[PDB]
């Protein structure tokens, strides 16, 4: 609970670090990824990696001082999976290794429980075409059909050694459903003066929130059915910059501050006039570049990578990294009781998210970040 807790802190530090990277690449567009999905995958590779490559992974992923990492991931995973049968959620992680890598038995048993079905050995080399056909159809079942051809044109070839694949989706169903008869077409500001049409969901109810005056913004927790996962929307009080209005929020964002800005302990319930845009974001990235910038160098290098504890084969190194994520937000949710008259016995604040905002979907039980993104526009 404390040996794990150090991990969620590392996983969150890395999440922000990679978020800040993916934001500079698309300074005015949407962002979306699963920090957890990626950390678990790169966490598995760290068991096969040695020397410099291993220290490089612990440095970038912050495992620097988190004992029993594989077990900590063993838990999150069992939680998220157990959750995938309740929620309309699915988070598939998979590290595909080429047979030409006689995987040492220790590595195979060492990571058999912590990383269950997340390690698969295929034949990219001699059977590239049949393999891809397998992976494509495989991931398609595991994501209930949400991901048809997880593999791109040139994502894998005769030379693919190791392959990371993260495919996750999630259709949100809140604890306090939105009434479709209250959703209406309205503008969504993309910058100081411009707007784009959007289906705005409107509701008035008790939500945990607060104000971060340091970044002149507001935080709010929108929990999902039976509070298992919660969405935290961080919205500026107004668009005050030459772009999205998230310039100052992003400049001050970091592992430390983020932890403070989304701390539920410091925020308290309030009758909120809630209006968040109805949306469906489906982004697919290639963290390869953003990852080198953070520190991972050797892991992708076929000349300096050191995956001793995995295979003795050479010319082996993390080849590709496929990361696809689809998040849809609607009015679907359960029903909820509302205190007698939260008019005078509760603050009547209002969170109108009609302009760019950053958000994270947290796994309340472990505080881990499952989904992380930015909504710059539709």
Curated annotation (Swiss-Prot):
PROSITE patterns recorded: SERPIN
Principal subcellular localisation of the protein: secreted
A Gene Ontology biological process term: regulation of epithelial cell proliferation
Family per similarity comment: Belongs to the serpin family. Ov-serpin subfamily.
SUPFAM superfamilies listed in its UniProt record: Serpins (SSF56574)
Glycosylation sites: 102, 136, 191, 364
Organism this protein belongs to: Homo sapiens
Domain of life of the organism encoding this protein: Eukaryota
A GO CC annotation given for this chain: cytoplasm
Protein's name in the database: Serpin B5
Gene3D superfamilies reported in the protein's UniProt record: Alpha-1-antitrypsin, domain 1 (2.30.39.10), Antithrombin, subunit I, domain 2 (3.30.497.10)
Role of this protein: Tumor suppressor. It blocks the growth, invasion, and metastatic properties of mammary tumors. As it does not undergo the S (stressed) to R (relaxed) conformational transition characteristic of active serpins, it exhibits no serine protease inhibitory activity.
Site (Reactive bond homolog): 343-344
Localization, UniProt: Secreted, Extracellular space
Subunit structure: Interacts with IRF6.
Keywords, ordered alphabetically: Glycoprotein, Secreted
A Gene Ontology molecular function term of the record: serine-type endopeptidase inhibitor activity
Tissue-specificity statement: Normal mammary epithelial cells.
């Amino acid at each position: 609970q404390g040996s794990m807790d150090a991990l969620q802190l590392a996983n969150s530090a890395f999440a922000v670090d990679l978020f800040k990277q993916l934001s500079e690449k698309e300074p005015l567009g949407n962002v979306l990824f699963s920090p957890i999905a990626l950390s678990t995958s790169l966490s598995l590779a760290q068991v096969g990696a040695k020397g410099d490559t291993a220290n490089e992974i612990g440095q970038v992923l912050h495992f620097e001082n988190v004992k029993d990492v594989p077990f900590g991931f063993q838990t999150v995973t069992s939680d998220v999976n157990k959750l995938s049968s309740f929620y309309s959620l699915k988070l598939i992680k998979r590290l595909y290794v080429d047979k030409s890598l006689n995987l040492s038995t220790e590595f195979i048993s060492s990571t058999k429980r912590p990383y269950a079905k997340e390690l698969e050995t295929v034949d990219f080399k001699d059977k590239l075409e049949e393999t891809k056909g397998q992976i494509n159809n495989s991931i398609k079942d595991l994501t209930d059909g949400h991901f048809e051809n997880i593999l791109a044109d040139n994502s894998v070839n005769d030379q693919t050694k190791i392959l990371v694949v993260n495919a996750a989706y999630f259709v949100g169903k809140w604890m306090k459903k939105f009434s479709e008869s209250e959703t209406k077409e309205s503008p969504f500001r993309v910058n100081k003066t411009d707007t784009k049409p959007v289906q705005m969901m409107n509701m008035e109810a008790t939500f945990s929130m607060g104000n971060i005056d340091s970044i002149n913004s507001k935080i709010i927790e929108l929990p999902f059915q039976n509070k298992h996962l919660s969405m935290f929307i961080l919205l500026p009080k107004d668009v005050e910059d030459e772009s999205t209005g998230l310039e100052k929020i992003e400049k001050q964002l970091n592992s430390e501050s983020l932890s403070q800005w989304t701390n539920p302990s410091t925020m308290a319930n309030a009758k909120v006039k809630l209006s968040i845009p109805k949306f469906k974001v489906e982004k697919m990235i290639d963290p390869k570049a953003s990852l080198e910038n953070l520190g991972l160098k050797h892991i992708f290098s076929e000349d300096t990578s050191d995956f001793s504890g995995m295979s003795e084969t050479k010319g082996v190194a993390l080849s590709n990294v496929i990361h696809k994520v689809s998040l849809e937000i609607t009015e679907d949710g359960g029903d909820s009781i509302e205190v007698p008259g939260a008019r005078i016995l509760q603050h009547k604040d209002e969170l109108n998210a009609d302009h760019p905002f950053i958000y994270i979907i947290r796994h309340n039980k472990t505080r881990n970040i499952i989904f992380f993104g930015k909504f710059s526009s539709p």
